[PDB]
């Protein structure tokens, strides 16, 4: 086998055409000698340029450079030969692997279906690498990764003195597979003798009484986090633990997972929220490719640089573009925030089931804006949303008016016979066929390619995108999405953000997006509803307020302050106990866009 790209980098800060004659390059260059364009002259910025499309990689120019402003490398037997696994010809292929490490938290960021999960099975002893050949042994794996830390992994893995435990990419499998209580389960799975510490730090002592099927999202997720650590294993691989956790939970779970590094145990993590990712990890991997054709894991990076580079879409270590535009964000000074017309107003409501109490203070709904809902789970974010939605009748007050409400529920389960196209089509055929919904909603969330399978025959992340798109293609005055964040990746999360923002702004309509992922809030929100009280008991919904004034108000009850990163612009979470943490909290401004 073979395969090879040439990559040329010239440290211009070291080049000086006038000192080496006249671009010693083009002169000494064999290809240019025979009438070729390996090295071209930028007779303006006065620099030399190597057109890697030519350069034989002979390296003559490199040896000649009177300084050493030239490097030419052949990505041979390293990027093409590395090839790890092929599922048979005309089928998915993996290149490279994430490099897990002891005593450290190895991060992963990169869109779904790029064989994140392919690598897990590989590492779990349950799939032998063929190295895109025909192999069915460990030994060729151990050799191929010679010069690297993963050889040592495959040697232990085969002796079988390590076995990694894996928190699966979809959960909601344990309730329909394991019956009885969270109390029970957590005794059973116990083998680590750390039962006390776990259940307490992740605050599942109230959550023991309920049965698995009676859990809400945040709780079910965390109970999996618990049961994975109580199984005995050195290596713990968490695939998407950000699903359905609220803002308060996800920051607290991050601390729990981070404390593992100190115990010297190896954590491998997928996260799709940059603030949570920054905080946990110590290494970071970027994974690039178009889903379902190939995936390649990049070289290990230090968390901060790795994230910067993801945002830029350009790899300077690997020389790969993988997205033709940059990840970007919206402050509050990059907008027009001007007042708009009142759609409706709601008085004081108060709903008591008699197993939770909510009071909603008097509030205004404006037209043409996007209101983010924030707070910890079971604080009746959902109780409010459901009162306008019509599935719950307020005990007192009125919200149920002649606005039509479009409602995306918290769980997703399908009950629909027929295709993705049937399901959408009966709502508004018309919308499907117009160019806007095609630029902003349907096309970048993959739905054009999804019309051929049934709704029941769609998987969690595709089906999520399908629910979301469905709710926004309903004909309504006001759009209600309860927690769409679940099972979306970074790119998806962002695409849904740009779609919500454009569609709502253009037709001047209201939407409520209950939200907990920092980035979506950071882009989309015009106004905020902060929830407080003590969850599972009482909640007090405070009236709508400005985006900044809201995230300020709320962040102060979490102890956790947010900056603006200076490298390429993203929400920077600041470590509890830091300079910035201390300066923000002292000065009553607990947040910056
Ligand atoms: S070799 Fe490339 S870098 Fe060294 S001087 Fe000539 S042009 Fe500038
Ligand atoms: S061989 Fe080395 S120098 Fe000659 S072209 Fe290819 S890269 Fe540039």
Numbering used by the authors: 1 to 593
Sentences from the paper on this structure:
Using a homogeneously purified population of the 1-MDa PRC composed of 16S ribosomal RNA (rRNA), 28 ribosomal (r-)proteins and ABCE1 stably arrested by non-hydrolysable AMP-PNP, we mapped the position of ABCE1 within this multisubunit ribonucleoprotein particle by means of XL-MS. To provide a second, independent line of evidence for the position of ABCE1 and the extreme structural reorganization of the FeS cluster domain in the PRC, we analysed the archaeal 30S·ABCE1·AMP-PNP complex by cryo-EM. In spite of the facts that archaeal 30S ribosomal particles were up to now not accessible to cryo-EM analyses and occupancy was low, we resolved the structural architecture of the PRC by a low-resolution cryo-EM reconstruction, in which, indeed, an extra density near rRNA helix 44 (h44) and S12 was observed. While the two NBDs fit into the body part of the ABCE1 density as shown in the pre-splitting state, confirming the cross-links between the HLH region and the ribosomal subunit S24e, there was no visible density for the FeS cluster domain in the pre-splitting position. Notably, with a 160-degree rotation of the FeS cluster domain from the pivot point (proline 76), the extra density near S12 and h44 could be easily positioned in a way that explains the cross-link data described above. The orientation of the FeS cluster domain is based on positioning lysine 60 of ABCE1 and lysine 40 of S12 at a Cα–Cα distance of 17.5 Å, using cross-linker and lever length as restraints. Because of this conformation change, the Cα–Cα distance between these highly conserved lysines in Archaea, yeast and human is reduced from 59.5 Å in the pre-splitting state to 17.5 Å in the post-recycling state. Lysines 133, 136, 141, 153 and 192 of ABCE1, most of them residing in the helix–loop–helix (HLH) region (aa 132-161), form cross-links with lysine 113 or 119 of the ribosomal subunit S24e. In addition, lysine 60 of the FeS cluster domain (ABCE1) cross-links with lysine 40 of the ribosomal protein S12. On NBD closure, the FeS cluster domain, anchored to NBD1 via a two β-strand lever-arm, swings out of the NBD cleft and converges towards the 30S subunit to occupy a cleft between the S12 r-protein and rRNA (h44) of the small ribosomal subunit.
